[PDB]
Symmetry: D3
Subunit: 256 residues, 6 copies
């Protein structure tokens, strides 16, 4: 298995002892994803991508973080929806920091954090900085971290053309839209109910944000764009592009 959790401590110790061990940490969230998809999408997707990449490059995958930072209206619909269960920033920051401290204790020095929930980004960044700060105080400066959001590897114009034959309207409205729904149809079809999709026009917002979050400014379903045209085939394409691109990036930063 490539999952650290499924290994004995002796097996893990041996992999790290090899001195070239790469660890991967999926960071997700329990967040509403429309009327047509389950709420653990942000955990399922980065974990599935990590699994495949780890199998290609000989890396291991740590248990993913099940809860992420508060959903923001313009990216995830807003933290007023039921189901969505969010952590405070200090909590998420602290979790990332603690794990890095422990991995360094094990002797590990290479970590890939794969985020699947946009709002997690900066707290993940602070967790890394605080951890690296401590490691320096402890005389350690060779711990390297690569942070990435799997979707960012889908930029090829040709690929976008395939995924959005009618035209691409941007990633800003991709919450429970074509992209994630397609990936889910290719990985966890049983967790998708495409007939429940509400085909509303893409969400549009003014150049600012309002707090407390106003429910009226988010499409009723919770989605920011329609997944009506999502499909397994699209998911297949996305998965291949992401897996191959990420595998290459990791080989580049953590050369064998």
């Amino acid at each position: 298995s490539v999952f650290v959790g499924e290994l004995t401590w002796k097996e893990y110790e041996a992999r790290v002892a090899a001195g070239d061990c790469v660890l991967m940490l999926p960071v997700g969230a329990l967040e509403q994803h429309g009327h047509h998809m389950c709420m653990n999408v942000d955990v399922l997707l980065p974990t599935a991508v990590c699994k495949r990449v780890a199998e290609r490059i000989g890396a291991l995958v740590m248990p993913g973080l099940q809860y992420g930072y508060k959903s923001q209206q313009k990216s995830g619909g807003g933290n007023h929806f039921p189901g969505t269960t969010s952590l405070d920033g200090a909590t998420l920051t602290g979790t990332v920091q603690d794990i890095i401290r422990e991995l360094a204790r094990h002797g590990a020095r290479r970590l890939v954090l794969m985020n699947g929930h946009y709002e997690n980004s900066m707290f993940i960044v602070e967790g890394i900085d605080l951890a690296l700060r401590e490691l320096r105080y402890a005389g350690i400066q060779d711990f390297k971290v690569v942070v990435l959001s799997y979707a960012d590897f889908v930029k090829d114009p040709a690929v976008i053309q395939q995924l959005y034959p009618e035209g691409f309207l941007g990633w800003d409205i991709e919450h429970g839209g074509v992209f994630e729904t397609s990936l889910m149809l290719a990985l966890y079809p049983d967790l998708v109910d495409l007939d429940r999709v509400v085909d509303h026009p893409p969400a549009t917002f003014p150049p600012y944000d309002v707090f407390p979050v106003d429910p009226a400014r988010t499409p009723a379903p919770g989605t920011l764009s329609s997944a009506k045209t999502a499909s397994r085939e699209k998911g297949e394409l996305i998965l291949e592009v992401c897996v191959q691109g990420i595998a290459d990036a990791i080989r580049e930063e953590f050369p064998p």
Copy 2:
């Protein structure tokens, strides 16, 4: 499915709207469990118990906490072992506190916290107290929490007898011993290999603790007692006992 993560937010909203919704949260850890068992045992076991209890009483199960508090020598072998990845107390406390705050926001009011890692206990308690303090400030006083360790439900002398026909040495040395291994043999056979079990005598300690933790005071394999006598049969018995007991406890504290 009884798993909240697998439901759409609409489905979740409806279960909570019913007004009698009981939620269950498994709290585990990534911790060494000897030469013969995987490291995510503390998550897998309470999650499996929750699943079965939930199916019988009509409850829902939240994504489990994958990382818990620092392993202690007399209970989990010590936090010096490789693989074990632990959180600071404030981090675990904050995670529990944040989740409760959010569940209260959904309108949920009944929570069962099932601990699978002994060391988690007091930080789970502080997380609950801080959350309930906040809820009072918010005018909420009807949120009720039941906290339990699934193992505490195995007290029937007749059962202990069938489990330890050679005599019961206590629960203080069960880390990776007969109890957990038997459960794993019944639930996750592929994550256990009794052939690797190190049949050493039960671990014993003086009436005090020493820090920095001394590795010499913990059996080399990481286990506190031998799981040589573990069996699927024992696991099946343990499981049915815990499931039935916890289900009744919940029916008692959260009467329909």
Copy 3:
């Protein structure tokens, strides 16, 4: 007299809030390197200048700006390894925002516009707001409203972008110390900008991931992510009018008399 709260007596401020619909504006910046051609307080100067003009136009007041912001990030501000840049931890910034909101609510104020001028501050500003509003709710206050925005987001009109980038726009991701901020500085604080010192390097490009510890070799030596060679006072005057008008209208909309 002045739109700045700091230049008012407590009696004057008190009277303005007594009006019942007084809008307060809070600039949130940073002390950060901005290439060889500009001073390091740009992120404070620009939003403060936009707030001043907007406040004057719609009758609002401006609170003292936050001089220090969150750690500079490589793909947005060059990186926190540069000297001069002086950054706060996330908890520190979040707490500052939270404290100020708590205090404004104590004054009786209920309308706040936070104008961020340093990209990296965004999420910590968001957390400060949420923690403050959470607290206000425990105190029985649910009518405090906050509008958060980055002034640059109001420059959307294609016709405006074409005038600013006649050779073609390449995205906002590489603007640190580039044409946009430099043009604004040329129009507002020409004394703090030396365009002759601009290093005309190609636009910074990055792979779809980030690396820590930050690698100095991945940021153009000058610290800028794009060349401000084509920056000008006229482009700055255009940006200012667009931002001021767009933001002033947004406030009238969200905070009507």
Copy 4:
């Protein structure tokens, strides 16, 4: 003169530490209800009295005790809903333990015994130690050693249990305000114990789970978890000698000259 650090001049204390193998002891207690028959500072008085005698016997010193501990839990101390009980949040207790260790390390001390007298303090004491040692490590100090113990854990000999509970021992989980602490108090602080006020109720029993908010009905009205009717100063004298001897030996073993 005295074994208490607080009663020494800094010169005296300094001289003792200069010895190179000076052991320090820190009692960690609480202000908690202990039934109708005993005062509320029991958790401080007892470990402090045991520390005093142990310190005297082995040549160690005793630091001022922590007067406030973690929130009382129903199954161990009755619950934090009782009047009088004054508890600290976990972070507060953890931070106090951490600060003291940091300071002792600055004095040059490297041997500490933490004697807990309030069960609920346990894990927060543990975290204080870990955070302090983590910090000492960053400072290049890895020779600071800590021994943590609850004095009651040294009464293990069945022959002793038999004398204390001739009618049969029923576990330590119900001891709060029972035979054990009451006997020690009768031997150490007779003026602070009124055995005639004891409420002889049956041993408290609970299901295999905990409930929050704490339900007052699940704790005996007096606050005690078991009756101290059979307590006596003679039982207390026995307990004290067993603890003093056992702990003194443990310290000589872990902190030899």
Copy 5:
């Protein structure tokens, strides 16, 4: 007894049930006090004063805080001295905050905080503000706190004359000097050896502070002024003056 710690919870409950109960909290420190006195002086003195005041007005005294904030050169000699054991500001602030929260829970509403260590001042103030802020959230606005340093009640020129016939040189030098030593000689003579007093000239400093603290800027003995002219007689005067002055202040702020 007037000490809360020596009462049973039933007795305490009864005194608070009266509705006019006044509580007193001594706040000291473990700090070096020259070659002639013990290090718990800042705990002993305020506690002694509280006892006598409490006896006269019918108040109760809470267990005192034994550890205070870091010693500052111009007030306590500096935190570079051995023996001195100080807490970080957040720790002291939180301790004060937690106690007030609990006293409020008991139903108490009148608190007198007697500081015996100058450096505690601002952290005590923050602890009080944070606690009162919290009480408001809970709906409590009738909790009142009086903060005072017993020394401030010795201002009468006549008394000053009697204490300093050779003229008073100010308070900013009264650390382990005449004032405190005189109180100790009268209250805890066994913890004072006047023959050890180092008769050095009053300490003086430039109009600024330096960090790291500079040892050479503090009189070698740790004292800021000689206590050679200290006496039991002076102590008795100080004591009675303070006890009386404070009792009157409390009667006024917490009118019977």
Copy 6:
């Protein structure tokens, strides 16, 4: 050239630190009411002005000032119940100071002068410094030195005092929005002062203790603790010159070439 770090490019700042003898100054103020006759940013303006003049004379640089300080206290600033006053919690201010020192150390700076203009900030500034130095020590840095001072403490000479308060001096404990500060302002920011609004009330007095919640009735209505009627530009100019000279010498003394 400028003495303000904010107005310099990172290259100019880097060059000044590279010299190896660079001294930095950080003004720490507050947004606090100052009577009916002055603006609320006095505590930032004054220390900043003094820093500029001192910096110009000794060749030092001035960091952007902290605009928000600790909660106002009745006996010193009048109380935090006044509108306009916008205060931070202690941890927030402490962390701000701590973060800045950590960053300055990272730049290679090693000499810092913290000029406080708000009495209540004092102890939180001290804690920020201690936590930062503790941290630097873990990093292997022990050559970072900080000088903390309040410009008002350099005006003690009887010659000047007599000139400032010929009618008689009553101490500094009553100098909030009074003669000392108003005179400095009249000499530095006359437009932000209107002596015609000064409320000539008797010097404030309080019992030997504090009360919380703060009692408004114990603070003179205007918010001032002593009349500034006798304040003058002439007096301000005297103070300024005295402070600037004294501070410059103190710095020369602590941070010798």
